[PDB]
Symmetry: C3
Amino acid sequence: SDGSRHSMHQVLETVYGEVPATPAFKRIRHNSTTLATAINTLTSEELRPDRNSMGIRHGTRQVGGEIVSELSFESLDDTLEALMCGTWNADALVNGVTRRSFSILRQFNDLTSASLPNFVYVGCEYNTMTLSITTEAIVMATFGIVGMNQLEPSSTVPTGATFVEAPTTEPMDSFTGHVKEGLADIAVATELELQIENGIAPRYVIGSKKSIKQSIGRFKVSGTLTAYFEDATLVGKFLREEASSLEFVVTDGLAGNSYKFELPKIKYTGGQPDVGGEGPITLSMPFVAEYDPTILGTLKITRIGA
Amino acid sequence: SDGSRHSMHQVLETVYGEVPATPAFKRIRHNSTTLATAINTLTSEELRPDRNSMGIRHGTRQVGGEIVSELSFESLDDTLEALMCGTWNADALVNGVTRRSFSILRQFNDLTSASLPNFVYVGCEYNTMTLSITTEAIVMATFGIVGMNQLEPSSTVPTGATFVEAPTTEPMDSFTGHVKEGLADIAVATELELQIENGIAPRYVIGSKKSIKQSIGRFKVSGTLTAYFEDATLVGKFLREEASSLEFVVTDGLAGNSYKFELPKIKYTGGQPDVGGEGPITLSMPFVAEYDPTILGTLKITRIGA
Amino acid sequence: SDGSRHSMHQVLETVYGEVPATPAFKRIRHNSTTLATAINTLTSEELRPDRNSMGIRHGTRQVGGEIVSELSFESLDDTLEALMCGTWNADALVNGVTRRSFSILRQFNDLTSASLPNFVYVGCEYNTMTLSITTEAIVMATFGIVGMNQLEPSSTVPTGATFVEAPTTEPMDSFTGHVKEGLADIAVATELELQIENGIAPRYVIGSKKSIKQSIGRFKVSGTLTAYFEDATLVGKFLREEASSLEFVVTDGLAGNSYKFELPKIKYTGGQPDVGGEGPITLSMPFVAEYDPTILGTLKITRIGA
């Protein structure tokens, strides 16, 4: 099979670890994927006179895959909602406690029917998200999922596997960036990085070969902010304890639709200006987001889409 | 000295740690080497007002060297026999227990007589072996050895150091149409990797700068198999518990002489088809070999040489 | 700010952690520096029902700067004296105990006055030194320091910040015909590496954000010596316990002035002639220096400057 002809679809699960009766598989616009499963190994230490390798025994299997997707409007909304464990309300999303389990199907168009091109992964729950914003570079959102187990390859797709398509809105660009840092101050930051962690780990019991359930952890928001040393206001906020805020907006290709990420309470963990021989002096300022009561959360994503 | 004018000769030892009376040093066709000795250090911890470095003391020594050689017929047979710890029988070798110690002599041809070019190592025992098979790439067998101690450089070669030569048979290539994976199924694997370990470790006692003996460890045979995702049979064998077999034959060339490696019982530890950004989908399937009572061993090398 | 317009100065402190009344800031000849402070984080482990980020707390702070400078005469002299903890006597320096603290000032000429270009670092103490000598390559000396805390950026320089300029002499070259290894033997070594460690670690107490003092450790001198395998005398000094000496001099074109580094007692920790396929055979021979009572120290730097 080749990476050129591949299709990926997902459906919200009503019962954990099972595909719905008529799965509404939805197309997932993406670039590269590593979704797969991992099986444990129980080695045998039986003594052998000829030192012959005794062998190993298989163990519980867990689906683990990382998918890379470009940020765009009318897309990745379910992924963000499930990851934030919240609900899209008034085009605004806040980190809450609403876990969502999905069933992802990997269909290899190039693979023939007899070759079983359908690979179904169930119990898949979004766990980690990586957001990177670089000037003149498409904004991409990497997604890490925790799946309970995978089904055997089969020629026939899941019964009633309706394949919904994904709106192909122009990918978001880094221009017209509303990068705010103070109460009303606009920062001169060049790149911006955001990481989201749900801390979802699996739980195995006697007589099971998969994670009956996945233990979610605390919602964690952190990131890295890089700017130029030309601005000296960023310097000091790290030296002296100061709680600033972060607020940036990704721009579409003049489509009139856009998002808005806001971190009301953050504190700088680092920040060091280095001569670095010749050339302009940069400034990397990693930060740690913390719970803010005004929004009853740590992060708030808002769609201003037209 | 330069690597161009370099040669290595080895002789089977009758008494461990000693060169035989009339060593039949045999030429070892090789590419590069890292064979040498390592001496431990015993630091001294004593308080000093001037805070001056107290000093460290030399400890036990261990000869450790890695030798890279291209796989070819009528060559490396003694290395394979010694490593496998078995004995060549009917052009077939199965992992045994018989341990063989050798004495390796490094002779820098460019180095002058007064410059002491001869380097002698005693107690050298083959510990590990790395076999890599790549398409349109010569098959090379890497060899790791464990020696007791290195003899001081001298001008005169060991008394009666007869220098036997090695048959310069054409290096084994990868152009074979025989790579078996099932009972009669021929696999479409692209590269194949095999690793062998003897778990040999040295033993130290009071009043001995060198290792008197080496406690041999369990015989270990494992490997990695990479193929194309086009074949879907291998896919799923990782997910389910299945014990397959591996059987591949390196081809010397037009001459009928060839080597046959067989692993009667293996199981796959991993396996993952990744779409990636673009291009074809590959498939890496690591495996671990296990004891098969039919051959009363883990691996069986067979020469079909004409 | 850009790395093109930056000035770095320093002044000997009379009281630890404080800039002198009128600092005689002296130009620091260097290629690049990383002078900056680092603050620890105290995370809060309070369980939250909405699983929100509790937030972290700032902890103690310390200043670390990497001063990369090119070795040259009439320069880094105070740096060498402070690092060696000795006193320049008869143009000869021996590892002593007397500790020296300095106040480093980084001035970004390009940064405007209102932009607060002056950066002051107090309690800076030279700790590590890395000297590398390569043929047809300028001798470089890296300087690691341990500072107490970083003063806030201000427009006005420290009161009476007289800016002395270190004498600028042609950088030292590797073209010397004097590299001694035996009692009178001249070695054929190609590169030479020297590392100096003072073991300065910071000390924290209750109610102090900064380190009140630094408990210095013992003086540590070690290095690495690389040569060619053409000389077989170096071989064996590692195999059989032998205590040699090292003595090398850096040259300054036709200026005449020079530095002389001497290690009266060293022994070699490694040594390995590697064939490496083709080309010449090199020989890396790491060594550790120790206490020699003839000089009452480990290392003795001597200026023969005209």
